[PDB]
Design a protein around this motif. Structure first.
Motif, PDB file in Angstrom:
ATOM      1  N   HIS A   1      60.014  31.034  53.766  1.00 34.30           N
ATOM      2  CA  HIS A   1      59.631  29.644  53.965  1.00 34.30           C
ATOM      3  C   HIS A   1      59.419  28.942  52.618  1.00 34.30           C
ATOM      4  O   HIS A   1      59.670  29.512  51.552  1.00 34.30           O
ATOM      5  N   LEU A   2      58.979  27.691  52.687  1.00 29.12           N
ATOM      6  CA  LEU A   2      58.692  26.884  51.509  1.00 29.12           C
ATOM      7  C   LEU A   2      57.371  27.320  50.898  1.00 29.12           C
ATOM      8  O   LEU A   2      56.417  27.615  51.620  1.00 29.12           O
ATOM      9  N   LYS A   3      57.328  27.374  49.571  1.00 27.21           N
ATOM     10  CA  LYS A   3      56.136  27.780  48.846  1.00 27.21           C
ATOM     11  C   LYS A   3      55.684  26.701  47.841  1.00 27.21           C
ATOM     12  O   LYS A   3      54.495  26.522  47.592  1.00 27.21           O
ATOM     13  N   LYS A  32      62.699  28.313  47.806  1.00 28.52           N
ATOM     14  CA  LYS A  32      61.268  28.235  48.114  1.00 28.52           C
ATOM     15  C   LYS A  32      60.629  26.886  47.752  1.00 28.52           C
ATOM     16  O   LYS A  32      59.412  26.705  47.871  1.00 28.52           O
ATOM     17  N   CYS A  34      60.552  22.452  47.473  1.00 24.95           N
ATOM     18  CA  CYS A  34      60.843  21.169  48.083  1.00 24.95           C
ATOM     19  C   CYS A  34      60.258  20.063  47.217  1.00 24.95           C
ATOM     20  O   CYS A  34      59.544  20.333  46.245  1.00 24.95           O
ATOM     21  N   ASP A  68      65.033  20.847  49.491  1.00 26.56           N
ATOM     22  CA  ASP A  68      64.553  20.150  50.673  1.00 26.56           C
ATOM     23  C   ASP A  68      63.689  18.961  50.296  1.00 26.56           C
ATOM     24  O   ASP A  68      62.884  19.044  49.367  1.00 26.56           O
ATOM     25  N   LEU A  70      60.835  16.652  52.021  1.00 30.25           N
ATOM     26  CA  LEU A  70      59.946  16.531  53.183  1.00 30.25           C
ATOM     27  C   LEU A  70      59.521  15.072  53.366  1.00 30.25           C
ATOM     28  O   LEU A  70      59.167  14.387  52.389  1.00 30.25           O
ATOM     29  N   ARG A 108      50.704  20.959  54.099  1.00 32.47           N
ATOM     30  CA  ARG A 108      51.667  22.000  54.437  1.00 32.47           C
ATOM     31  C   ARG A 108      51.336  23.320  53.745  1.00 32.47           C
ATOM     32  O   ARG A 108      52.093  24.284  53.849  1.00 32.47           O
ATOM     33  N   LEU A 110      51.420  23.971  50.549  1.00 29.33           N
ATOM     34  CA  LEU A 110      52.343  24.228  49.452  1.00 29.33           C
ATOM     35  C   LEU A 110      51.630  24.197  48.092  1.00 29.33           C
ATOM     36  O   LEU A 110      50.647  23.466  47.899  1.00 29.33           O
TER      37      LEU A 110
ATOM     38  N   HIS H   1      65.097  36.413  54.833  1.00 29.37           N
ATOM     39  CA  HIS H   1      65.207  37.849  55.097  1.00 29.37           C
ATOM     40  C   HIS H   1      65.969  38.575  53.980  1.00 29.37           C
ATOM     41  O   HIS H   1      65.605  39.683  53.587  1.00 29.37           O
TER      42      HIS H   1
END
Lengths: 132, 132, 132, 132, 132, 132, 132, 132
Positions: A1-3, A32, A34, A68, A70, A108, A110, H1
């Motif tokens: 996911h996004l970090k 990772k 955004c 990404d 957001l 979120r 982040l 993954h």
């Protein structure tokens, strides 16, 4: 996911490969990261005010296409509102767009990546990193 | 379909029933109105910093239930970026959050409803109304 | 993303490379331009009524290949309806197809690119450029 | 699925239940009818220009909520362009918005329902009905 | 759904608007027509062997974009194989591509539209129409 | 993945185990081979016209079960059309169904396996093998 | 659909309008051209190593917007692998990235457009054109 | 993954179970590994140049069936382009295919698994491991 949520100058440093440490860490964290649409706003502004707006817009759009973006939503707004009130009680200054970016990241969970850690560290419940 | 994007003071007036004409027009235009998430942010800040945060937060939930909240997205950001550059060229001052609200509305062709007409009229290509 | 909606004459100028300034700005803005399906309609009419329909139709398919064609939708229709009533109140004349793409552009926050700025500047909440 | 595309006047008659024959046949054909977004534009125009715009908008929007609105797309544009050239050759006048609706219907194989059959019968390859 | 499969000459007639009766019925049957990819092959061949290949290709590709193209699949193959054997028993000659088009249409229960009824009527269990 | 497209005679050679070299190389390339639906058509015709259609049809079902049957699609049709025009310019004869699988194979980068290399070598941009 | 895969130099020539014959034929074939991502890579390298990276990157973004970029996939790799082995047996030299785009093009039946026909003609089962 | 992108030799080591440490670590990392299509290309080349191609292709394809193959896409191309320019600027030599899978891995934030770490460690912003 996004970090990570990257702030505006971290994006610019990455595009410029200067300081070289930013792009280095950027690439190590591919997949990772955004940005807030608020940061996109700032990036567009930078291009629009420049001598070669169309050129710089194209460069920004290319960069943005690989990460990404957001949307600043109700959750982001809510956290920003809370943060501005928390900051005001404590007498801690954070710039208006940074406040929004801080709220977006916090909403979120982040990590904010920024060279303005002095400002973002004033925010409660938020992690920061500086890659520069 | 959405026709109006309400600025923060217009929302507050609606909530307070003062000036009472605002709520009147609000009620006439039920189903046609929205706010930017930027304005939501400002409303939450106002509630959070107030003497009775929970009371005012609850009141906001009621208000928001009657309208759409629009996410500040890439299109909104882009128009805002353009606008900030346009304003700076002209030496016209508009506050940071108003710039974003202006950009958000313009990206969707919405009418900004505001009592801050002098500020928003500085933005190009944007219609405004004042219900107060 | 999309920034400009081109009206028929601007499209024709681009194709003909005359005035050369149009194709120049067209090339600079590649990837950011569209036409309304209304403008496509006008282009197809132009080819169909021409001395050499198959040739001119083929030229249109090639041109259209480089830009987005946006469907005239409910939002476009709604803005157009509003604009027609606004214009009628003020006694400002705008051609029927121009009214439609004005409404289309305004609903999407797009800049109308046209050599008929005298007509399109009559429309509220709409920005234009002339590349010719 | 869809069989009929309704003209503006047919919609208005339906809403007003006068002539009663229009609403009668309208209801007998429930589920088989649509309007072009071009017709939506005309309906909105009528409401926007009226003495009580917010009222008439609500009335129109409610009616539209129960029928399909088709976007005016590339196929519609193509048929409209062809039709305008065919009509021009024959010297047959058709109003601008009627031309588009004729094209929209023909591109989808739909029957145009109109009390202006004198105009729409000038179009080739198009079926028409009058329910009034 | 699909009712008609158009053979090559019918497509060309439609494009040329000559005989005008073909496009007329083509327009009346919008949404109900397709071609076999075998017919697409013949159209592409026609363009490729012409004096202006790129132009005529654009014309064909433009036409084809508004109608369905069906892939010649195993069921089409099977019916074609049956038909060729049925025809050989009867001493009834049908051209190689017409055999495939016949088989494709029959496998889908489609009516073949052709001005070559002499060949296609030799095929069993297949409906044909001539719009020319 | 798929590497070979088998023409009709090669399929038949495989089924009959004569020349035995064909089935041998077929077994060595199991999982890498296909036929065009055009070739399926030819096989079905051969069975349907034979003295024992049901027996030969059953044999085909078993054979087809070991390989992929590819639909003759728009790309196949397009390549075949180009090829047909090119062959006509050079005055090179290739049978109609052979032209289609040549086009089918070329559109997919497949090697045509055939004992009719004389014909297929006339096609441009196409590799062949003979396993017989 | 797609017919041509442009090699790097052809793309550069198109950009520079030099030799002008390339852009000339390019414009004639709009909507029918693509590049391999392998070619995109070389273009980006060319921009990044230049005196003015941002300017040249922006020009590439514009160019790429006018054509399709195809991902170098398993089929492309397989053909390239085959080709490298074919070439090594014959002792024919082709540069590493050229081998890959040749394989990419052959896997899709595309015509390679290149000013290096000397290298590309060494590859089996591949058609080439030189527009320069 | 996915965590790892495997270089060609590592795949071969795994297949051969020699050195035994590679397969050991491969199995410990099941579900976390992929190869670039560029590496697939190299594996296919190796099989094709071998004395028993059909056999070695089957072994590789079986191997490849149990791991993900990533298409070399625009992001991969972009990173490779940046990398080639940086390596040239620094005077660091890296082979052509290695450059591509380095860029591919970097664009996805993957660890390159290779017995050629000397070459791959010259690339910026990239993690490497050697399991041999």
């Amino acid at each position: 996911h996004l970090k990570f949520m990257l702030d505006t100058n971290i994006c610019i440093f990455t595009i410029k490969n200067k300081p070289a440490s930013v792009r280095e860490r950027f690439n190590l964290n591919q997949g990772k990261m955004c940005i807030s649409s608020v940061t996109l706003m700032e990036l567009i502004y930078g291009a629009e005010k420049s001598q070669m707006p169309e050129r710089n817009l194209a460069v920004i759009e290319g960069f943005v296409s690989r990460i990404d973006v957001l949307d600043y939503d109700a959750a982001a707004a809510t956290h920003t509102g809370q943060i501005r009130a928390e900051l005001a009680r404590q007498g801690r200054p954070v710039g208006p767009f940074n406040q929004m970016i801080a709220g977006h990241a916090r909403s979120r969970g982040l990590i904010i990546v920024t060279n303005n850690t002095r400002e973002f560290e004033r925010v409660g419940g938020l992690r920061t990193e500086d890659w520069s």
